[PDB]
Design a protein around this ligand. Structure first.
Ligand SMILES: CCCCOc1ccc(C(=O)NN2C(=O)c3ccccc3N[C@H]2c2ccc(OC)cc2)cc1
Lengths: 338, 299, 53, 215
């Protein structure tokens, strides 16, 4: 009976492809052929955050667009004031093999995780005066690749054990488990309404999950290698993925297809991070070639280059007001550009 | 005949080449190792050596001008004092820091566990002040005794005038002979013997250890070791030997004029000795793969 | 029931409502055009109101 | 409100001093990546006083050993996290030459993948060939031709172990920047930790020579 089920799955995939092609009439480049180019985005390093003694693997911006948290393999989680380059906090981690970090939307908490398979939540208020581990979340059987706060009590984590999880911080239990991938999930992005989230994995596919229900609504394919990064468009109806095949792609949830591909023949290294700008007109992507590339998200062109790091650009974020871009690198430095 | 004129302008051109190359190389080392590389103990040592060499070579045009007109000083009293202070501080600091680098390398090779546990950047910054303190202490008589004397025919030599400290018409003998003999003895013993013995012993120990452990794969380690030792020796030993011979034959040289060859060998040998300032960055800094890569990536 | 789960997921994915790529592109262009003036990276802000000097 | 600005600058400077002190403390340890089989036996040997860390001290040298055996996910996604360890310890069970894909063939493939890795071009490898006694007992009843058809020596432990050592060190395609230290693991006290200490000391000396400029 397995053969019949496989044949039925193949014919369902053929039907899905046919429906997608039928709904495909015009291309994004064709529609945006009339619009004028953005120009040459020339950003300058406004600030240089130093103090990490090893490679920086992740960073997150605060909702206030002034404070930012960064994680390094020196076992340090540093909270910086970007305006003054003042180290507000330096949290020592029990495990130095951190791979991700998150900032709570309220700014009251911070999160980290890595090869320990544990998401650690840190209370930042601490009227006693010292940052403490508020909760430690266990249940993932693979390394923690990404984590994002929904509220002060909810967090969604994507792990290298092929799954994603929505937690209850107060009880420390997995409220919901999202399965369906066939490779390590390496990134996740929450929708602006925190009702859906997209996750990209090493099976060269991305998936869209409903947080309240817990099932994969849509699956998007087209990359050739592992998807390392994923981000949401500001309006919440599209998303962008950056993979190891040196291309970024833009997918539309409503059309359930790819829209645009951002790739150049001079680029052969994989994308580590992706991030949109406030309007969604610019797509910034970090690369292994030590540079960040600013792409026109509508015309697929390349609008600028940020080149100030001596090693991999591993983390990349844009503030909630769109004013600045923070770029962390394996050379142990963060840089704020305007 | 003509050979004397060759010996006359040879130190001048040697010192000019030394000035140009030393300024360029030491500036490159300072810029790269202080603004493009992570701070390590070896980087701090190289930066200190480069600062000493650069500050010495920046004073080289003044010494060239003074030597071209027969040790006359055309500048002022303040410039004589300042230039000779810089020259002494940085020329003693160069050899002291070369010995410091040799000792640091020997410790890193012969006691790797102690070096791993104790050799830190903060400790290196604290202990690298010692060579500078010793050089500054050796520079005290330039602070005090040196000054500009104008002989009847307005000739203006910047020398160690002793008339102020004297009180008799025989204040030259036993007050200047003793001071100059002590100066020469200290020059040979502390300026040459101590750093040379340190360098030779430390690099011999390093060579013996890496030979016994079977780490010599290519010839490059031995080539670099022998170049580092031989450059210091060849640059400094002829000048130091000539200066020591002048020290031990000072009385019978100045009283009667016996050893004129020692008198005329001072300038070429001293120029060869000062050439080590431009030689040092190539020997110590432009020999490292990481430094060369950072330099080519910066320009 | 991994096969049953796969069949159900593929059936649910196929039984979805899709729109035109032209419509999606038009929506993306409309959003970008509506929020362009409020983008400090697309249009740099004067240094008087720039927090990062 | 500038008193608070100076207070914030003071707090940041204190944090900077603490970070510098912590980094100085951390740089003093020797970081070892344990891969592999007798891995637990080796850990028990170096046992004095997701990823599991084992810290020990030998002759005033501090070693931090990391075991990542509980990482069933793809290694190439996190292996770069260990770019910069002092050395890699690789454990191979000598008695796996009978067990089945052959276990020793799988071990050789893993060793080749780890050694010829873009993140470990100059990292030295300490290869432990464990289960010497079980291998010696099995080599008298199951010839090495069961594992390697090209073997031609007698069914003796010395020759059949020299062959395995040589054909494990042959996978090193970069014998110009890294060294492979092979030890046949024995239950003798402090022997394996002394071997690790010697190899790590050699690695430290070579790193110092490279940093200074001799190598
Ligand atoms: C009682 C004495 C206590 C102090 O001891 C001494 C002894 C000797 C000197 C001395 O020779 N200084 N130089 C001069 O005058 C000079 C004057 C003009 C140009 C170059 C000079 N080169 C230095 C010098 C020579 C050799 C060195 O070797 C490392 C260091 C510096 C200075 C101080």
């Amino acid at each position: 009976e397995l053969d019949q089920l496989r044949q039925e799955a193949e014919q369902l995939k053929n039907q899905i492809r046919d429906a997608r092609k039928a709904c495909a009439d015009a291309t994004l480049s064709q529609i945006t052929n009339n619009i004028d180019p953005v120009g040459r985005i020339q950003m300058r390093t406004r600030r240089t955050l130093r103090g990490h003694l090893a490679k920086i693997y992740a960073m997150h911006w605060g909702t206030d667009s002034r404070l930012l948290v960064s994680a390094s393999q020196d076992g340090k989680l540093i909270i910086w004031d970007s305006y003054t380059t003042n180290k507000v906090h330096a949290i020592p981690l029990r495990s130095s093999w951190v791979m991700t970090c998150a900032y709570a939307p309220s700014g009251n908490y911070v999160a980290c995780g890595g090869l320990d398979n544990i998401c650690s939540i840190y209370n930042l208020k601490t009227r006693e005066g010292n940052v403490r581990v508020s909760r430690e979340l266990a249940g993932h059987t693979g390394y923690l690749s990404c984590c994002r706060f929904l509220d002060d009590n909810q967090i969604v984590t994507s792990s290298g054990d092929t799954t994603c999880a929505l937690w209850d911080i107060e009880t420390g239990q997995q409220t919901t488990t999202f399965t369906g991938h066939t490779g390590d999930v390496m990134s996740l992005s929450l929708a602006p309404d925190t009702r859906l989230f997209v996750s990209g994995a090493c099976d060269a596919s991305a998936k869209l999950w409903d947080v309240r229900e817990g099932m994969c609504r849509q699956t998007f394919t087209g990359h050739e290698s592992d998807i390392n990064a994923i981000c949401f468009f500001p309006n919440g109806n599209a998303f962008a993925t950056g993979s190891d095949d040196a291309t970024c792609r833009l997918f539309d949830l409503r059309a359930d297809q790819e829209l645009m591909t951002y790739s150049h023949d001079n680029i052969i290294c994989g994308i580590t991070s992706v991030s949109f700008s406030k309007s969604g007109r610019l797509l910034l992507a970090g690369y292994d070639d030590f540079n960040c590339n600013v792409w026109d998200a509508l015309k697929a062109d390349r609008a600028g280059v940020l080149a100030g790091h001596d090693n991999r650009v591993s983390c990349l974020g844009v503030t909630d007001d769109g004013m600045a871009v923070a770029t962390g690198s394996w050379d142990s430095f963060l840089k704020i550009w305007n | 005949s003509a050979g004397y004129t060759v010996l006359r302008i040879l130190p001048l051109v040697v010192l000019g080449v030394t000035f140009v190359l030393g300024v360029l190389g030491n500036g490159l080392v300072i810029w790269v190792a202080g603004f493009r590389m992570t701070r390590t103990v070896t980087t701090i040592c190289y930066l200190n050596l480069a600062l000493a060499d650069f500050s010495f070579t920046a004073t080289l045009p003044f010494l060239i001008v003074s030597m071209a007109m027969g040790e006359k000083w055309p500048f002022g009293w303040f410039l004589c004092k300042l230039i000779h202070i810089v020259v002494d501080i940085n020329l003693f600091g160069s050899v002291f820091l070369i010995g410091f680098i040799a000792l640091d390398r020997c410790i890193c090779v012969l006691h790797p566990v102690w070096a791993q546990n104790h050799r830190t950047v903060s400790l290196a910054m604290k202990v690298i002040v010692g060579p500078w303190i010793l050089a500054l202490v050796l520079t005290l008589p330039v602070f005090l005794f040196l000054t500009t004397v104008t002989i009847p025919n307005g000739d203006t030599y910047c020398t160690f005038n002793f008339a102020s400290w004297g009180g008799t018409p025989e204040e030259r003998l036993k007050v200047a002979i003793t001071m100059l003999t002590a100066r020469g003895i200290i020059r040979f013993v502390i300026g040459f013997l101590l750093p040379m013995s340190i360098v030779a012993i430390c690099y011999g120990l390093i060579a013996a250890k890496i030979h016994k452990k079977g780490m010599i794969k290519s010839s490059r380690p031995l080539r670099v070791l022998t170049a580092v030792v031989a450059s210091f020796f060849i640059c400094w030993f002829p000048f130091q030997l000539v200066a020591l011979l002048g020290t031990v034959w000072l009385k019978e040289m100045l009283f009667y004029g016996k050893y004129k060859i020692i008198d005329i060998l001072v300038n070429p040998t001293s120029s060869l000795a000062f050439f080590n300032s431009c030689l040092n960055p190539m020997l110590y800094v432009f020999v490292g793969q990481d430094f060369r890569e950072r330099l080519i990536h910066s320009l | 029931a991994q096969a049953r789960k796969l069949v159900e997921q593929l059936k649910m994915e196929a039984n979805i409502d899709r729109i035109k790529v032209s419509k999606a592109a038009a929506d993306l262009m409309a959003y970008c055009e509506a929020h362009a003036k409020e983008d400090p990276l697309l249009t740099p802000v004067p240094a008087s109101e720039n927090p990062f000097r | 409100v500038s008193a608070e600005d100076k207070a914030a600058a003071e707090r940041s400077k204190m944090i900077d001093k603490n970070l510098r002190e912590d980094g100085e403390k951390a740089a003093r340890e020797v970081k070892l990546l344990l891969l592999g089989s007798g891995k637990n036996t080796i850990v028990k040997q170096m046992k004095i006083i997701g990823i599991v860390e084992t810290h020990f001290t030998f002759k005033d040298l501090h070693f931090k050993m990391f075991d990542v055996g509980a990482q069933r996910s793809e290694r190439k996604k996190w292996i770069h996290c260990f770019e910069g360890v002092t050395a890699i310890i690789f454990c191979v069970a000598l008695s796996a030459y009978d067990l089945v894909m052959n276990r020793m063939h799988a071990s050789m493939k893993l060793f080749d993948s780890i050694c010829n890795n873009k993140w470990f071009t100059d990292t030295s490898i300490i290869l432990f060939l464990n289960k010497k006694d079980l291998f010696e007992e099995k080599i008298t009843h199951s010839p090495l031709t069961i594992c390697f058809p090209e073997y031609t020596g007698a069914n003796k432990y010395d020759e059949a172990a020299s062959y395995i050592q040589s054909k494990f060190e042959d996978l090193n395609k970069r014998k110009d920047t890294k060294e492979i230290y092979t030890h046949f693991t024995c239950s003798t006290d402090t022997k394996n930790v002394q071997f690790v200490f010697d190899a790590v000391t050699d690695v430290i000396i070579k790193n110092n020579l490279k940093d200074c400029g001799l190598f």
